[PDB]
Symmetry: C2
Subunit: 102 residues, 2 copies
């Protein structure tokens, strides 16, 4: 059903954001360790910093799509006359909204 497709599209986008946020947190820990050790060569620290920057640039566009996907689902629900239970859809919208606000 179209409802099901729109809900899964959003649920899968928010799950991916979580996945990417794990990576980003793990990379920052690694850069923190190198930055704290003054015996580390600035070039080896830079290689790692430049990689973090790349990962980070991914998030902005991801949040742009989470918003579109959320708005799409919300607009679809305002005129929905079907018989399906829309609780999962509402719950998906709330979780996405929480993320955008955080």
């Amino acid at each position: 059903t179209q409802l099901d497709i729109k809900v899964k599209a959003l649920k899968r986008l928010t799950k991916e954001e979580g996945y990417y946020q794990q990576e980003l947190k793990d990379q920052e820990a690694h850069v923190a360790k190198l930055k704290e050790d003054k015996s580390v060569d600035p070039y080896d620290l830079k290689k790692q910093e430049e990689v973090l920057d790349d990962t980070k640039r991914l998030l902005p566009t991801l949040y742009e799509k989470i918003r579109e996907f959320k708005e799409d689902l919300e607009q679809f629900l305002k005129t929905y006359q079907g018989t399906e239970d829309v609780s999962d859809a509402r719950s998906a919208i709330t979780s996405a909204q929480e993320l955008l606000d955080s």
Copy 2:
């Protein structure tokens, strides 16, 4: 040691590529299913295709960094005089090279 830092830097990049390659494979499976179903609204399919395209854009820059990190490690080894066992380094270089050649 500087050797260990360079080896790890590279090994973590090749492990990241594998992670991102899983995400990509899972997204194409999803888009594939929506593309076969002709009952699906062009816009819902498009939402998914656009996301796939983004995921893909991430790989090229990732391969560029694997090569740079590979070359940095290879260059470091040409003049290495330490006492550490460099088998792990050579092994890291080989896996990275396989990836880039595939």
